[PDB]
Every structure is written in C-alpha cells, then in structure tokens.
Amino acid sequence: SEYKAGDLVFAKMKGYPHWPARIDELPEGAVKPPANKYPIFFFGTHETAFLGPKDLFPYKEYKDKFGKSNKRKGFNEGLWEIENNPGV
Numbered sequence: 025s026e027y028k029a030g031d032l033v034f035a036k037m038k039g040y041p042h043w044p045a046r047i048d049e050l051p052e053g054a055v056k057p058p059a060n061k062y063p064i065f066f067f068g069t070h071e072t073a074f075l076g077p078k079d080l081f082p083y084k085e086y087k088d089k090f091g092k093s094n095k096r097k098g099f100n101e102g103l104w105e106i107e108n109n110p111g112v
Contacts, residue, residue: 027062032083032106034090035064035075041099042081042090044106048072067110068102 027033027047035045048065050056057063057074064075081090083106093100105112 026077027080032110033064034081034083034086035066035073036079036081037073037075041094042086043099044068044083044091044102046106046110047080066102067105067112068098068100070112 029049031047034042036042044067048063050063061074061076
C-alpha cells in the first residue's frame, strides 16, 4: 500500500532522469502490471510503463532535488504538467 492511484511521483527508468509522473488508474480491461508494480503515466510525454516501488519517489518530497529542467523538451513539459494539469 506504498502508493495509490493518483499519487504524484518521480519515476525512474534506466537511462533517463527521474521523471515527473503519476500512479495511473488503468481503464477496466487494460492489462495490469505484475502485482508488485504500479501503472505509471509519465507527464510531458504521456508514456506508460510498469514500475516497482524502488523506482518511485513521492513528488513533493523529492521535487526540490529531482524537479530540475532537462535537455529533453518532454521532460520540461512534464514538470509543467505535474504542476498545472496533473489530471490530464
């Protein structure tokens, strides 16, 4: 019960900076993650992946360190979205 649908996070994918994201509530009928993982929606890019808790970080706790702009336009747009339109 570490995370719940709607929680704002940074999500870490190998090869990419810790990324603004949310714990998604998948539509009924969608393929579910393994039971130890969570469906992640990445802000800015709107990508979707399954991640375990070791790759997730609560947003407000870590935003002063992780909420820095990046070379990737989609990352910067993601910072805007998590701040202004997290229910996109």
